[PDB]
Ligand binder design. Structure first.
Ligand SMILES: C/C=C/C(=N\C=C1\C(COP(=O)(O)O)=CNC(C)=C1O)C(=O)O
Ligand SMILES: C/C=C/C(=N\C=C1\C(COP(=O)(O)O)=CNC(C)=C1O)C(=O)O
Ligand SMILES: C/C=C/C(=N\C=C1\C(COP(=O)(O)O)=CNC(C)=C1O)C(=O)O
Ligand SMILES: C/C=C/C(=N\C=C1\C(COP(=O)(O)O)=CNC(C)=C1O)C(=O)O
Ligand SMILES: [Cl-]
Ligand SMILES: [K+]
Ligand SMILES: [K+]
Ligand SMILES: [K+]
Ligand code: NA
Lengths: 458, 462, 463, 463
């Protein structure tokens, strides 16, 4: 059993090591001691989870949202793009600003920006590095950053490396909290009051851990109300919007017609685009600022030709209409999941199971591939184990977050209605079993009995 | 021709922009003001120099050290690598510690680890991200970091985000400074004295800025002597060693047999290996440390199959010996340059008067090996003149100036590659001696050199 | 029946074409990708709506403002104009400044000029080409243009090609915004401070998009205060005013007695005058500027005799007073509409909740006059539902949406014509109140209204 | 008489005006200053020349190439076309894509396209607007435009408005320059090299200023060689070819059998077709591209029925064979002119006094064009004009602001309705000019002016 085998390795990985580290050098003892801190809570990460790719579990976990990886469609365009460039120069040769620039990557960038409705684009090795560059290079002394509390890890790191004086979180997707944070921030800085510095607003368009969507039109209207002099600028991380939201996959910003109102956008390749990389979107002033003040970009090797070609190939497919049907299939399958799971209420009334993104899903203009499923914090591992032993691959969400743990289901275009049925039934089995147990605090459910057994066994 | 066009485009990009932004929104005014800061010292970067790629100028500037890029050898081995995996799964699917792990990347890392004498390898999308991960995940509270002053920018970004309380720089490649740094750090930290924490030493095997080599065997001795309880660990950034140094381009650590002495090694793919990416070498304790405490690795998409394949391909060409002749031709051409330029008649007079200086060429005959990095110094007031003199002669070299180094410490970096020729080297030596001659005559007679007249004329026009 | 047919054809035209183009030449693949851009927001336009012309739907959408088209009144006067010149030389023979000038066109321009109270007139083949010529020929290097944000597309095209250094927009019909724009431009340009160049002010008399009216008197006084040197000039696009506003349809500038104070006026023939073409009014200096510096006029064939004839015929019908009854009936029917819709019981509730909005209808009894243009707003999410509701109810209204306006600003434009009737207006009011009633019940009860169900079913069957 | 009266007004027009404007508003003074700038070089345009129409001068200037206007033949068919449609709806009602479409215009368009051998056709108010629409809507970001340096004003305007990154002119009708333009363009862009963007090639089939013909077969071959992936597209402006070149007037593209190889063609009505309008020819992909991305078309009034009817009438006459004789007569009269002027010549041409390049190797041309440009010394150009005019021969002067200052010339237009006797008179008047200018030259007196100029200079001194 590839699932069970991965389980025993994960079991064996949580065994404490530093008790056996007494004769060992201080450096290695301190490292294994720090690894033991995570092994103690059994939160050590080692080899991850690969059953979703080999066919041994249903893929409700991965970031291959459009199934461009699964089907080989991105690979086929990539090799074809390469074939149309038989003598391509593989190596950039150096820094993007110190000799590593070349026509192909500049043209691919502009082709991407034209597709997304932006003036210019600038390519990074990842979404994370794009966020790092944005919040390192862009904010000025005196600017403030007002951000959604659930922005990405890379956004938090970047803001910490920023020149920005004041950074303020606001409650997730909450319009009143955003208005409070902006007003108070406006009321505490005399160079924001007179418009010589700016309020930077950091949002995700689709939140990777909650699946909700940024109400961008309403936030823009609030920003103007609070900042009548126009001294604000939105920064929108679209990692989970590109290819999934908006016509032909263009993203939330362009779907809403906001490409001229949103100063900086991040569109990453690691999810629906089934590869790696990112572009940062903005005008030439924004682009020049990254080229000159993002030390990370200045001092790293510019992208190789195939890294650019594979990104071109994903945009080729979205541009030529080749992802529209997969994108519609995502909407269909997610809605179908919501329809089923909500039809089978008790467990939700009690606290056993909760899917916040399924509330009022009917009134949503669209849905997202991200389905976070909450249980009781004491039950989260058991929910994870229940689904995995059912041969359902999901991602457990726990160092990443504060008693905020949950599982994240990812619905992909390549999933089927039958697999969704199987997931709905499995979740109901897990529900029913936890209401039974609650209605002997030592009682442990079926899946967790097997896991605890393998823990005793190895 | 082309070189003049690039220079005009460069000149125009330094023209102040804030005077034309008074009606713009705040955000955009202040960004152009920040950019005007750089423009005003003529230090704004936009598209860089491209004449080396086009043939419009000799390549004494790129990082394609073994010319694996120029020849198409890496491209050929890369496409053949994809060919052997006809239906490869392109996408990782997520983070390396969530859904994104797979057999091909684990096996390619292990091939690399085996070939480089390391227990394990862990792949990142660049050398820089490898340094970020090491110094954010490895140092513990109470550790100290003693680093050579010339470590890479990304190691500075790294250390500043680390949990270590003490970071101490030593004068570049100075053993006495290193000894003064280890002892004063040790004696000032009781948790280092009793051996409950470690001193982390940060070096480059080949320093990209100066081109000299780390005295690692002697640095290790100083470290054991200063830290008797063995609470130290060496971190070697081998970005400019891999491919250029050691048998089959294994780098400096393995070339000296120190693969068991150096806890953590960084091997990048952006120079001699002619792609992007990097591997961090260590034992499984180091590796798992990176996978669990390098938040930058945890929250990023794991490399795609073509990314792993091109790295596997570059190492392939090293493993099989297909890079040996290219590695030997760097040693040859570099020694050829040194022999040629030092035999020049102006050489003594230029270096005597202070008009030219090539520190890496001092006593090159005693060196066991040489490197591809040849920094050339003139008088700071002549530096841009030296740079455009070469440029006008259709020789691409790299300009080293602010914001990369302090103002008043500008130089030029000649980079010698496998695919350069003795003809080109001769032309370079001849061009440098002509610049040296011209400055001698100016100093021995408000005259400016010919290269300076040409820049000043372009500046008057643009 | 026919409404459904065109809706199917419209749905089919939005289906993406690029996936079928893989083996086509580069040129053709890239045009269909470009077209797929618009298809992908269901924004592709092909043949538009025709039910209003065929009697299959009531005409609340066309630009045949005085119904001179519908009744054939212009056709008859045009063929009579031809009959009075039985040997007419059809062909101009070349450019208007290179051998295509002739007496008949010069004399028709002068008749139009005298009737509209302007020194001269210069004829173009469209209002658009008139605006192109004005803004490429007139502004000088150093001049500035301050334009209402809602000026016509052709004016945006003319301005982008102009010689003027500064183009400043101002908030639509906003006197405070205009003052800020005039003063900000005045205080940033020394060439305007010493009176060596001019501020050109660009407005519409009747804004095609909103149906409101430019406060021309207030704006001229603001210009005189900010420009005490008198170095300003007004340019008024009267496209939707001629035939509708002012005695015998003379338009807003002559109605206000401003023909001495507005340097350049554009009167188009494509709406109330029921044909095509335009004239630019000014003195002989303005006219000569256009004939010499408007490269678009210089390098195009001067109008044919039948083109001039139909324009003269439309102006005859206005000069003789034959259009005054039709002009007055627009006032009546529009006033009849505002009476009915703002008297419905659902009106307060619909407008309070934001389910219906008709800005132009507010305080309409105080306005000196009304216009034929009646924009109706619902929730953005409900817009196409409202449009299809009207269409299924066999009422032809104009859809206002991207790429014509920004996304999220979509609305519906009702066009009230002289040949509409109170019964038709009754049906429109009742149909609107039916939509508002239905959305009220939905918002108080994923329920979609009836019109949305019919369109969702059509999309299911084809799309 | 009127020839002379035209002169006096044209003389009076050039009198500077801004000196008398010291007290005028800035706006009006600056405009009259701008006019003075043209008046200074005797280059202000006002009323053109009409003597060719009234029979006061021989028409060797106008664009009525087939004499369809002169004979009233187009007028008769036009009125007959209208008569076959007794209840026609004159007014389009609005935008072609927003409610102004109708059956008759779509059918006339398709009838034109079928005759010209094209898949579809799309009607514009003029040839210039057709060019504007093509070059604004068609080029994509990343495409290049390689154009003959002598393309039309409207092509230059349109290109300036396009999304195209690279525009490259090549030496007129020169296949070497065209190949060098294509090669340097293909080798400067990697998206052209991989066939993901296109090179658009812009030519006239018959150049309005030079009378020579585009060597379209060889250019297509050069393009195929330089763009092996087929990522190019030709755009052929046939304004001066329809009705004049090709069997039954079909134009150059169809004559050569290249209708499948030219992506886009422009066929205008203002010359041989003797009215106004144009169509753009292409497949349904090109036509939809214009309908959606030519904002000039989207935001203007669709053509009225009589505008469509008169274009149909022109094509009816070509389709039914009723212009073939006139077309043949142009060929006859043009060749007769070349034979006469060639057999008089050598000395004038050798000295630089007179040149007619289109007369070189005129025997070895497959056909000739109606455009005959006549060159003298730049210092003698208006003098040649005044000589021809006072001889009662109407020709068109071509100078700044239409061509560069030192590229001035006179354009003779030969029409089907001219006679051999008029050609005799033209040849003799031209030889008298040449012999007079030869003498004046050989006399050494740089202050001597010719007989025609004396009368003009005298007319100037008087008024
Ligand atoms: C590999 C981790 C991927 C991942 N998210 C990464 C994100 C990143 C980082 O992008 P990346 O370095 O993978 O190219 C930025 N922004 C958002 C909103 C993200 O969700 C996820 O699984 O939810
Ligand atoms: C693009 C800049 C490359 C560059 N150096 C990058 C280095 C880096 C960063 O490598 P990278 O992020 O490009 O993969 C780490 N260490 C050392 C010693 C380096 O020299 C150089 O030009 O010397
Ligand atoms: C085809 C009809 C267009 C149209 N308006 C055209 C206008 C034009 C262009 O007129 P056109 O070229 O049709 O003769 C100029 N100015 C204003 C204010 C216009 O409203 C409309 O429907 O509102
Ligand atoms: C006003 C008439 C102009 C004129 N030609 C107009 C042309 C135009 C413009 O056509 P138009 O707007 O008069 O219908 C396009 N292309 C070419 C080649 C032309 O020669 C001429 O006398 O040659
Ligand atoms: Cl920096
Ligand atoms: K922008
Ligand atoms: K019809
Ligand atoms: K027309
Ligand atoms: Na944009």
């Amino acid at each position: 059993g590839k699932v069970v085998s991965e389980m025993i390795a994960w079991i064996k990985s949580q065994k404490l090591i530093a008790p056996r580290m007494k004769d060992a050098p201080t450096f290695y003892r301190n490292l294994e001691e720090a690894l033991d801190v995570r092994r103690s809570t059994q939160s050590l990460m080692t080899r991850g989870q690969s059953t979703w790719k080999t066919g041994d579990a249903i893929d409700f976990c991965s970031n291959d949202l459009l199934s461009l990886g699964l089907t080989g469609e991105l690979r086929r365009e990539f090799l074809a793009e390469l074939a149309r460039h038989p003598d391509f120069s593989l190596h950039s040769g150096g820094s993007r600003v110190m000799g590593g620039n070349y026509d192909y990557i500049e043209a691919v960038e502009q082709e991407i920006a034209d597709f997304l409705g932006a003036e210019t684009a600038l390519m990074f090795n990842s979404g994370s590095n794009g966020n790092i560059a944005i919040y390192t290079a862009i904010p000025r002394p005196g600017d403030a950053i007002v951000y959604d509390e659930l922005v990405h890890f890379s956004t938090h790191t970047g803001m910490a490396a920023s020149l920005a004086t004041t950074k303020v979180a606001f409650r997730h997707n909450d319009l009143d909290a955003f208005r409070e944070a902006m007003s108070s921030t406006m009321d505490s800085h005399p160079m924001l009051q007179d418009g010589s510095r700016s309020i930077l607003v950091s949002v995700e368009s689709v939140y990777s851990m909650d699946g909700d969507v940024c109400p961008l039109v309403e936030m823009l209207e609030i920003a103007r109300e609070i900042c009548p002099k126009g001294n604000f600028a939105f920064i929108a991380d679209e990692a989970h919007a590109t290819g999934v939201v908006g016509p032909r996959g263009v993203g939330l910003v362009k779907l809403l017609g906001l490409e001229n109102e949103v100063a900086i956008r991040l569109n990453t390749c690691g999810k629906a685009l089934a590869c790696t990389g990112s572009v940062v979107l903005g005008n030439a002033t924004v682009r020049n600022m990254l080229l000159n003040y993002a030390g990370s970009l200045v001092n790293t090797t510019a992208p190789s030709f195939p890294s650019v070609a594979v990104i071109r190939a994903a945009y080729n497919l979205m541009r030529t209409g080749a992802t529209q049907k997969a994108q519609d299939n995502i909407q269909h399958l997610v809605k179908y999941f919501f329809e089923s799971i909500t039809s089978s209420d008790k467990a939700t009334d009690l606290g056993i199971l909760s899917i916040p993104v399924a509330e009022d899903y009917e009134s949503l203009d669209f849905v997202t591939h991200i389905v976070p499923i909450w249980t009781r914090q004491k039950y989260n591992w058991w929910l994870f184990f229940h689904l995995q032993l059912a041969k359902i691959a999901v991602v457990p969400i726990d160092p990443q977050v504060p008693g905020k743990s949950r599982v994240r289901v990812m619905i992909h275009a390549g999933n089927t209605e039958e697999q969704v049925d199987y997931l709905v039934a499995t979740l109901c089995d897990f529900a029913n079993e936890m209401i039974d147990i609650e209605e002997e605090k030592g009682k442990i459910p079926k899946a967790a009995q097997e896991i605890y057994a393998l823990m005793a066994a190895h």
